[PDB]
Scaffold this motif. Sequence first.
Motif, PDB file in Angstrom:
ATOM      1  N   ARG A 186      41.754 117.099 -14.321  1.00 61.60           N
ATOM      2  CA  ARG A 186      41.861 117.682 -12.849  1.00 61.60           C
ATOM      3  C   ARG A 186      40.694 117.046 -12.012  1.00 61.60           C
ATOM      4  NH1 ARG A 186      42.154 124.124 -13.529  1.00 61.60           N
ATOM      5  NH2 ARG A 186      40.623 124.130 -15.131  1.00 61.60           N
ATOM      6  N   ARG A 187      39.463 116.737 -12.535  1.00 59.79           N
ATOM      7  CA  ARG A 187      38.387 116.248 -11.729  1.00 59.79           C
ATOM      8  C   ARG A 187      38.802 114.926 -11.238  1.00 59.79           C
ATOM      9  NH1 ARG A 187      34.747 115.679  -8.245  1.00 59.79           N
ATOM     10  NH2 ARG A 187      32.555 115.515  -8.835  1.00 59.79           N
ATOM     11  N   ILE A 188      39.479 114.207 -12.014  1.00 63.42           N
ATOM     12  CA  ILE A 188      39.724 112.739 -11.643  1.00 63.42           C
ATOM     13  C   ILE A 188      40.957 112.870 -10.545  1.00 63.42           C
ATOM     14  CG2 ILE A 188      41.130 110.503 -12.290  1.00 63.42           C
ATOM     15  CD1 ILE A 188      38.022 110.973 -13.281  1.00 63.42           C
ATOM     16  N   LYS A 189      41.929 113.729 -10.820  1.00 66.54           N
ATOM     17  CA  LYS A 189      42.844 113.939 -10.063  1.00 66.54           C
ATOM     18  C   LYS A 189      42.329 114.410  -8.469  1.00 66.54           C
ATOM     19  CE  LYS A 189      46.689 115.482 -12.793  1.00 66.54           C
ATOM     20  NZ  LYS A 189      47.522 116.722 -13.191  1.00 66.54           N
ATOM     21  N   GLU A 190      41.061 115.472  -8.337  1.00 68.75           N
ATOM     22  CA  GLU A 190      40.565 115.666  -7.047  1.00 68.75           C
ATOM     23  C   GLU A 190      39.962 114.597  -6.598  1.00 68.75           C
ATOM     24  OE1 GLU A 190      36.803 117.734  -7.903  1.00 68.75           O
ATOM     25  OE2 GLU A 190      37.373 119.266  -6.170  1.00 68.75           O
ATOM     26  N   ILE A 191      39.267 113.737  -7.416  1.00 70.94           N
ATOM     27  CA  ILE A 191      38.558 112.579  -6.709  1.00 70.94           C
ATOM     28  C   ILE A 191      39.483 111.243  -6.276  1.00 70.94           C
ATOM     29  CG2 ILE A 191      37.171 110.599  -7.121  1.00 70.94           C
ATOM     30  CD1 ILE A 191      35.825 112.564  -9.311  1.00 70.94           C
ATOM     31  N   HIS A 195      39.534 110.351  -2.211  1.00 75.15           N
ATOM     32  CA  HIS A 195      39.248 109.180  -1.544  1.00 75.15           C
ATOM     33  C   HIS A 195      40.104 107.790  -1.740  1.00 75.15           C
ATOM     34  CE1 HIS A 195      35.006 110.840  -1.451  1.00 75.15           C
ATOM     35  NE2 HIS A 195      35.207 111.159  -2.626  1.00 75.15           N
ATOM     36  N   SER A 196      41.196 108.192  -2.483  1.00 77.19           N
ATOM     37  CA  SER A 196      41.924 106.920  -2.747  1.00 77.19           C
ATOM     38  C   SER A 196      43.395 107.310  -2.459  1.00 77.19           C
ATOM     39  CB  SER A 196      41.777 106.543  -3.943  1.00 77.19           C
ATOM     40  OG  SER A 196      40.511 106.319  -4.278  1.00 77.19           O
ATOM     41  N   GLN A 197      43.915 108.291  -1.637  1.00 77.14           N
ATOM     42  CA  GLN A 197      45.296 108.685  -1.364  1.00 77.14           C
ATOM     43  C   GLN A 197      46.095 107.541  -0.908  1.00 77.14           C
ATOM     44  OE1 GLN A 197      42.658 110.140   0.583  1.00 77.14           O
ATOM     45  NE2 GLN A 197      43.746 111.065   2.242  1.00 77.14           N
ATOM     46  N   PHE A 198      45.578 106.418  -0.187  1.00 74.47           N
ATOM     47  CA  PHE A 198      46.481 105.549   0.327  1.00 74.47           C
ATOM     48  C   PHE A 198      46.216 104.093  -0.113  1.00 74.47           C
ATOM     49  CE2 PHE A 198      45.637 108.786   4.009  1.00 74.47           C
ATOM     50  CZ  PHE A 198      46.635 109.195   3.803  1.00 74.47           C
ATOM     51  N   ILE A 199      45.964 104.139  -1.277  1.00 67.48           N
ATOM     52  CA  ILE A 199      45.958 102.704  -2.038  1.00 67.48           C
ATOM     53  C   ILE A 199      47.502 102.458  -2.320  1.00 67.48           C
ATOM     54  CG2 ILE A 199      45.281 101.718  -4.205  1.00 67.48           C
ATOM     55  CD1 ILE A 199      43.264 101.775  -2.475  1.00 67.48           C
ATOM     56  N   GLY A 200      47.550 101.114  -2.288  1.00 65.09           N
ATOM     57  CA  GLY A 200      49.082 100.394  -2.166  1.00 65.09           C
ATOM     58  C   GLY A 200      49.651  99.954  -3.411  1.00 65.09           C
ATOM     59  N   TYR A 201      49.083 100.478  -4.108  1.00 68.07           N
ATOM     60  CA  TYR A 201      49.649 100.354  -5.828  1.00 68.07           C
ATOM     61  C   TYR A 201      49.739 101.604  -6.695  1.00 68.07           C
ATOM     62  CZ  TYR A 201      48.714  95.556  -4.162  1.00 68.07           C
ATOM     63  OH  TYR A 201      48.340  94.325  -3.731  1.00 68.07           O
ATOM     64  N   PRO A 202      50.517 101.420  -7.638  1.00 62.64           N
ATOM     65  CA  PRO A 202      50.629 102.790  -8.586  1.00 62.64           C
ATOM     66  C   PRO A 202      49.549 102.877  -8.973  1.00 62.64           C
ATOM     67  CG  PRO A 202      52.549 101.410  -8.548  1.00 62.64           C
ATOM     68  CD  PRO A 202      51.492 100.509  -8.063  1.00 62.64           C
ATOM     69  N   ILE A 203      48.904 104.293  -8.814  1.00 60.90           N
ATOM     70  CA  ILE A 203      47.601 104.618  -9.915  1.00 60.90           C
ATOM     71  C   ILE A 203      48.413 105.701 -10.832  1.00 60.90           C
ATOM     72  CG2 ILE A 203      45.528 105.656  -9.848  1.00 60.90           C
ATOM     73  CD1 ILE A 203      45.109 104.993  -7.114  1.00 60.90           C
ATOM     74  N   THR A 204      48.229 105.271 -11.943  1.00 61.94           N
ATOM     75  CA  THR A 204      48.667 106.313 -13.217  1.00 61.94           C
ATOM     76  C   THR A 204      47.243 107.013 -13.942  1.00 61.94           C
ATOM     77  OG1 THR A 204      50.787 104.976 -13.383  1.00 61.94           O
ATOM     78  CG2 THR A 204      49.979 106.529 -15.046  1.00 61.94           C
ATOM     79  N   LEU A 205      47.232 108.151 -13.707  1.00 58.65           N
ATOM     80  CA  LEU A 205      46.189 108.928 -14.373  1.00 58.65           C
ATOM     81  C   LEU A 205      46.458 109.245 -15.850  1.00 58.65           C
ATOM     82  CD1 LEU A 205      43.605 110.242 -15.168  1.00 58.65           C
ATOM     83  CD2 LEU A 205      44.109 112.225 -13.581  1.00 58.65           C
ATOM     84  N   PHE A 206      46.123 108.418 -16.934  1.00 58.54           N
ATOM     85  CA  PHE A 206      46.692 108.642 -18.360  1.00 58.54           C
ATOM     86  C   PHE A 206      46.094 110.303 -18.698  1.00 58.54           C
ATOM     87  CE2 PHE A 206      47.797 104.468 -20.315  1.00 58.54           C
ATOM     88  CZ  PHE A 206      48.388 104.144 -19.262  1.00 58.54           C
ATOM     89  N   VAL A 207      46.744 110.976 -19.659  1.00 60.00           N
ATOM     90  CA  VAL A 207      46.323 112.021 -20.060  1.00 60.00           C
ATOM     91  C   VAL A 207      45.909 111.920 -21.549  1.00 60.00           C
ATOM     92  CG1 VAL A 207      47.248 114.467 -20.575  1.00 60.00           C
ATOM     93  CG2 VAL A 207      48.200 113.357 -18.773  1.00 60.00           C
ATOM     94  N   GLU A 208      44.865 112.550 -21.961  1.00 64.38           N
ATOM     95  CA  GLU A 208      44.178 112.581 -23.447  1.00 64.38           C
ATOM     96  C   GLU A 208      45.119 113.048 -24.283  1.00 64.38           C
ATOM     97  OE1 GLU A 208      40.117 112.291 -23.635  1.00 64.38           O
ATOM     98  OE2 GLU A 208      41.172 111.116 -25.099  1.00 64.38           O
ATOM     99  N   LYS A 209      45.175 112.646 -25.369  1.00 64.03           N
ATOM    100  CA  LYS A 209      45.857 113.081 -26.747  1.00 64.03           C
ATOM    101  C   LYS A 209      45.242 114.007 -27.446  1.00 64.03           C
ATOM    102  CE  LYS A 209      46.770 108.834 -28.382  1.00 64.03           C
ATOM    103  NZ  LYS A 209      45.802 108.118 -27.541  1.00 64.03           N
TER     104      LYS A 209
END
Length: 209
Positions: A186-191, A195-209
């Motif tokens: 959640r904290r990483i999604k928020e950040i 700050h980075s919503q218009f970056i022109g490459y796919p950003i994948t936030l991996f999830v902890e197992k």
Amino acid sequence: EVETFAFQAEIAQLMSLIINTFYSNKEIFLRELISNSSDALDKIRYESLTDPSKLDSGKELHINLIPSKQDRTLTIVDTGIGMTKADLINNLGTIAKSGTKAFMEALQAGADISMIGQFGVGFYSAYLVAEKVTVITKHNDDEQYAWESSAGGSFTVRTDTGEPMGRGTKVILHLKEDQTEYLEERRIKEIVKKHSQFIGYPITLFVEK
Ligand SMILES: Cc1ccc(Cn2cnc3c(Cl)nc(N)nc32)cc1
Ligand SMILES: Cc1ccc(Cn2cnc3c(Cl)nc(N)nc32)cc1
């Protein structure tokens, strides 16, 4: 074999400033590292337009954010152009000298640590949240290297013999004990949203197992 190098004096003092100055707005490190990844991806994509063989080491152009609560690390992975040995040992630091001096003077003239990216030295914002940073990187036509520093004035470079990455850079943030909030999904999604919503490459936030 491991080679140890001294930081240039100006970079050592900037790193001490980032470590010792009281500054609560630490989250900007992520924006800066994603910006660096995006710039690296821009560079290899541009170069591939005149030499398509530069993507033989991988056509995918993306950014992955990988938290590990087991290791207390946040890793920023990109498949950008990567860094050579000469980049890591000498040439990036030579370029950074000018902006580092200007940033330090700006800080005395009222500027904020969050403006670090405007001076072109945003990588060092990693030490807002990390006690140690390990950088694994692979550029076409050089080997895969591991750069590492816990500040204190020195860094190491060695040839890396972990899992080959094809091409790109992995910034492994060994987080300070009181900075584990940057492992929270959640904290990483928020950040990233902020700050980075218009970056022109796919950003994948991996999830902890
Ligand atoms: C030790 C150190 C690591 C990183 C940077 C910033 N930086 C420069 N070139 C880069 C590429 Cl190619 N990719 C990425 N991700 N970051 C890059 C500066 C110094
Ligand atoms: C491919 C690419 C080029 C330039 C940057 C900007 N950038 C951020 N931090 C930096 C430091 Cl510490 N040194 C230097 N030389 N450049 C830095 C990022 C990625």
